Structures are given as C-alpha cells and as structure tokens.
Amino acid sequence: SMLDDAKARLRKYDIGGKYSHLPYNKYSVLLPLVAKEGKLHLLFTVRSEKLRRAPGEVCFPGGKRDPTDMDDAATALREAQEEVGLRPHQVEVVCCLVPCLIDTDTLITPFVGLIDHNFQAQPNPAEVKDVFLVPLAYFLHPQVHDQINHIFEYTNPEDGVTYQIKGMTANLAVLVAFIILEKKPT
Numbered sequence: 001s002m003l004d005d006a007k008a009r010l011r012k013y014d015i016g017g018k019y020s021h022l023p024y025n026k027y028s029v030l031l032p033l034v035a036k037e038g039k040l041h042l043l044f045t046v047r048s049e050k051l052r053r054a055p056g057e058v059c060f061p062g063g064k065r066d067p068t069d070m071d072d073a074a075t076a077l078r079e080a081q082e083e084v085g086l087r088p089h090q091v092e093v094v095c096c097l098v099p100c101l102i103d104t105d106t107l108i109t110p111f112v113g114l115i116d117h118n119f120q121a122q123p124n125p126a127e128v129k130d131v132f133l134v135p136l137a138y139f140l141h142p143q144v145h146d147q148i149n150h151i152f153e154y155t156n157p158e159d160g161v162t163y164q165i166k167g168m169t170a171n172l173a174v175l176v177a178f179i180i181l182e183k184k185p186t
C-alpha cells in the first residue's frame with residue numbers, strides 16, 4: 001500500500017537516537033505526512049506575525065525541548081499539539097531523519113510522522129497564522145525563485161494563495177520527497 005510503502009522507505013533513513021544525547025541546545029520538528037486524494041502531502045505552518053523570531057515564515061511544527069519530554073520525538077509531538085492541535089493518537093512517528101546543526105551550539109532533530117486521516121488542524125493563533133498542505137511531489141518540480149539563495153513558491157489551487165518555502169524547511173521537504181517518491185513504478 002502507499003502508506004506501508006512510505007513507512008518502509010522512511011525506516012531505511014532512520015538514524016534513531018544516535019545523536020540525541022549530545023550536549024546541544026535541542027529543538028525538534030515534525031514533518032507531518034497527510035494522505036489526501038490518493039497522494040501524500042506535507043503539512044506546513046505559517047508562523048504568527050507577532051512572534052519575535054521569524055514572523056510570517058513557513059515552518060514545520062516544532063520547538064525547543066523541555067524537561068518534560070521523554071525524548072526528542074516527544075518534543076516534536078508536544079509542540080505540534082500546542083501549535084496545530086495534533087493529538088498523539090493522531091500521529092505515528094516513523095523515523096528520525098538527519099539532524100540539522102546551526103549556530104555552533106544547536107541541533108534540530110526532524111521526525112517524520114504519519115497523520116490520521118480524521119485530523120483537522122486547529123491553528124493556535126498566538127503561534128500559527130496559517131496551516132496548509134503541499135503535495136509531496138511538488139518538491140520534485142518546485143517553482144524556484146532566487147532572492148543569492150533558492151526559494152520555493154507554492155500556490156494552493158484551492159484558493160490561489162502563494163506561500164514561500166525556504167531554508168531548512170525547504171531542504172527537509174525535498175529530502176522527504178526524494179526518500180518516499182524516488183524510483184517508483186507508475
């Protein structure tokens with residue numbers, strides 16, 4: 001099946017807890033995979049304009065680890081619940097992808113999660129201005145704009161709204177798309 005195939009592909013790239021005990025400032029992100037209309041999608045947030053760091057930027061749900069978290073996956077799920085109302089029964093964490101090093105002292109761990117088909121986002125407006133889906137296949141043939149660094153522009157065909165996706169968020173989206181969609185019979 002599509003979903004069993006995606007999970008099997010993802011598991012091959014799982015690094016597990018290999019880098020998780022290293023003494024960094026630790027953040028986790030959840031890369032939420034949603035199946036709609038027979039295709040996989042990634043769920044993205046737009047950060048609230050009122051936030052002091054990266055207002056209005058497209059990001060995956062996530063945030064800083066706190067003492068309550070049993071592990072890095074827990075961080076991702078806690079923050080996703082706070083930001084978009086995703087409850088733990090509504091997500092299956094499939095793997096941990098390569099972590100992202102930034103600022104010399106920070107490690108961001110991405111987890112891919114399969115999201116329940118009955119989940120409906122409840123954007124928390126203190127943190128999230130918007131939530132939207134992008135088909136995973138888009139990241140194989142993105143509309144690229146150079147600002148010099150590469151920016152993806154995705155227009156939602158439902159409403160014509162264009163979102164800019166860049167940086168770590170864009171990079172991770174492409175990674176997930178490659179992992180899941182490469183070398184597939186039509």
Ligand SMILES: O=C(Cc1ccccc1)Nc1cccc(Cl)c1
Pocket residue numbers: 027028029045046047048059060061062063064083108127128
């Ligand atoms: O903050 C993140 C994930 C993240 C973690 C670490 C570095 C870069 C992105 N995501 C998010 C998205 C919407 C609202 C809020 Cl409050 C946070």
